[PDB]
């Protein structure tokens, strides 16, 4: 064989990411720390030199022609614009319904603000200012009363995570949702995306307990089949999922006895008390700076979880 | 009161070539470079069997000819070799200290020894799979004492 | 002989090595006195040993 | 220690380490040697796992056989050909009588 | 790979019954019992050692 | 980063073998070793779903969740170049699985060994005597309803093989013969005559469920007597305790076997190596998915 | 991407401490913080598993859950260097654990606080007044076995042969594991959740499967029916009297499976580790966080 | 070194064996004995034949 040809190929296969660098001064800004800190882009000008510099044509992960970095995966959807307001911000966690129709093509996605008026029919003032008609969403789930009275609603929703891009389509709306990966915007000026959650639904679980500092904290959503209708509380915590189910069991241990105290589960299925589903992790330190969401006539407080990473889990029953 | 260190001795790995060992007398070798693109091979023999014009009354066998074909079988071999992250990090850094320069030539010789283990393991695997090709196509001699 | 020791010392291989120790103790033990019975094969036998 | 009504035959098998001859005639097969191809396959924080591909193609340039293999000398009977009947309460574990 | 391990199957019966015209083909074996009502029970085989 | 695994066939293939294997060019299957060059004896589910042994879903599920999986990519006449799935990146799979369940995008997928019969998803190779069994890749709610309706048909076949007055063969066939999901109303294949004493698929798992439901009345009562009125209210008959009639080492053994047969069954109902698909596109039936 | 937790020690380290540390190189260490440099306080389970007579294994599980995990690879004077385990990267976990449970090929290990005695896994540092205790890394069928043994002891000692329950039975050599008398409040809370779950289980439970076992005990003796010793239970026989239907047990099974998945999620506490290419002779296991 | 394989087995990487060799020391001492009379004859001086 030939060691000479294989030396070139292994020399190409050599470099790991350069982890350590022994800097001497900070004001020099030399070439070595420049090559250390440079991140390769994901979009560039459609030309010769800009593409062959930014390197979109490298396989697997881009390089100028592993790092703890992977490109995101998308879920692209088609919806009526009568169920989705174009004036909503980018980072909202979307909730795709699975319709009982075999071939649809159009989806039934749900902003949780829009998803609030399905449950009911501050928070409700903005929810009725935004999506003014309960009927244009009560036909996306054409059988809601039989579906939630049989407690069969938690296995019917797939949380698809945060939106990234919403082209303002007129009749049939197209959104662009990241269902797994690092939530970044698909724009030519690249900005950050923050998963905005309404302040009413969001309840923090770390401050609800009121030691060991973790690196990443995870956001949850959790349907609860309460007596006054389904609610959609968003729990933020930093523990394992099997710890989260148990601490939610002890948290809703009043509410299980409340649901028994108001009605008796005459049929077997009524004992199923809600379900919980993860959405993904984020840094627990610099996370969920509060802010406000501005519509035309009113405003509601909103929770911007910065620098997300979406990773959906399944539906786990709490009872 | 000292402890004397007498010596560090290491073995020098000899290299064998396939065209050095005498197993290659029983084989024919060609460097077809892009052999993965060859999905199938085909040699074809034309054996025209003559016959004897008999005298008695028998079924006469006419002009016979045997077209027989043999297809190739590929053999894809692979070993593994590890290289740690520390000496690779030493490789991609630049030495400026005599201690780190000693670490640098140590890492360079480590990677060269790993590469030589790779090519030598591939050579031994080549002669191994040649031998196993031969043992797969070798009937035992208590059959060939009669079938030959 | 690595012909018994090529796949490593397992239980059965070491047991067969113990039995081969017994056999080489009973048969090929004293290579000079039992060579007297070979007569003319003495030089070849002792050269082989 | 009386005889039962049946008379079994026993079957055993005995592994015999032979050190065989191998003949293989001149120019039996033609070989194509490819190119070695190195490819990493793990990237962990301790050690990246290199692996090298190599592919060759052998094909026999004769129609009939060109290689044979006979056992020259018995190295040893590596088994001890004793009486170790395998117990049938182990090979068929789910079987049992009434009580 | 030339140190292959052959496998030979060995068999032997246990406790057969001889035909009724019993006989011997060598002398100097005198078992102190009835030779007509004699019956096998065992199989004294030889080991590797 | 390379993922090319080249299994190498001993004898090269016959023509209908290629004509079957090219029909499963997008299927996934368990690799026993995750290494660079393999042999065909280690490919998918041949040594655990062997026809000459009694199979079981527990050992197949354990082999499946234990070993790596690998999407098949290329099939030549002698080497089946296939790539393994790691949790680092995403892949493009195709649903060519003979009980056809119409997939949908952003639905959680699973891999299960074949329950609907061996001959649907298999390639009986006559070149080398090796039987590649391809596992069923079907979406998760469909799959767990399949497991429920197969287990129920199993125990219902057994209880009418015991006595014909227990269950009716039409009501067990109307309800458990069919699945319903998103309007797509598929039909299952029911093995009606599995033979007694098990000796087929899903007959220890039914016995697992049976020993678990048999020992739960002595388990919940033991646990509530080890600890009240709300727990002792919702059963009206099981609250009648008889625990002072049973010996404590006997109850210890029953609780141990109940705990093992509960944890095994409950990790088994969790659906194995669970895949996460984004956008199922049924114009080409390809589904972009990554390992979850 | 560098993962290296240089743990500076408060004072120096003795030679016998170096010898007891270099034995367990390649093992899992929890870390209270995740940052690049720490102190020896917070490291190991010592902050929850201090020198107390009563252990709280449920709180120790809750310690090991949210905290990061790390492999140890080097120790010198004043500095034992670890290496962080982040989800997504692969590591070499060495089986240098003192109750020598042998691992399977490419199975799944789950870390656990030491139930086999504190001093069996404890590196005493009298110099820096700290007891760096270590977790226990064991295969998952053994881990759920010791979890069910812990819970069975926790109910059977407070409700009453039990010392043989306390002995776990490995194939090579059996082990005895240290057992507390009280769990703390969280252990009893998990017991309330278990008793509630099991009461709903025996509410929703089907009936023709009982017709299977009652009809099968009297008909077939099996490897999974010898535990009854030819005796149908009382509750099963007096529940089995009624006639059957299929669609009702279809609903009963649709809630049984969802509740058993949550019941399995009760015992799945403690992290999980996906291993590959385990060696009996090199004692390494290529493993990444699951 | 090791051999690359075709079949799928868990390959050993590059191996390296480290073994050390100690030295054995040996003391030796016999007891030669000289009588005091010859010693005093040597330390003195002669004059007399």
What do you see in this structure?
This is part of a larger assembly, with one copy of chain A (319 residues), five copies of chain B and two copies of chain F. With 319 residues, chain A is α+β, with helices and mostly antiparallel strands. Chain A has helices at residues 3-12, 31-37, 49-54, 112-120, 124-130, 135-138, 145-149, 206-209, 241-251, 253-262; strands spanning 73-80, 93-97, 157-167, 172-181, 194-198, 202-204, 216-226, 229-237, 275-283, 289-294, 299-306, 309-311, 316-317. In chain A, helix 4 (112-120) crosses helix 5 (124-130). Chain A is globular, with a radius of gyration of 24 Å. The N and C termini of chain A lie far apart (66 Å). Chain B is an alpha+beta fold. Helices cover 36% and strands 19% of the residues of chain B. Chain B contains three helices and four strands, in the order E-E-E-E-H-H-H. Chain B has a two-stranded antiparallel sheet with strand order 2-3. Chain F is of the alpha+beta class. Chain F is built from seven helices and twelve strands. Chain F has helices at 15-21, 57-66, 140-162, 171-175, 205-215, 217-225, 248-269; strands at 4-8, 28-31, 37-39, 68-72, 79-84, 90-94, 108-112, 122-125, 130-133, 136-139, 275-281, 286-291. In chain F, a hairpin with a 4-residue loop joins strand 11 (275-281) and strand 12 (286-291). The longest helix of chain F is centred in the middle third of the chain and has 23 residues, at 140-162. Chain F starts with a strand and ends with a strand. Strand 1 of chain B pairs parallel with strand 2 of chain D. Chain E: This is Major capsid protein. Chain E: It is found in: Virion; Host nucleus. Chain E: Belongs to the herpesviridae major capsid protein family.
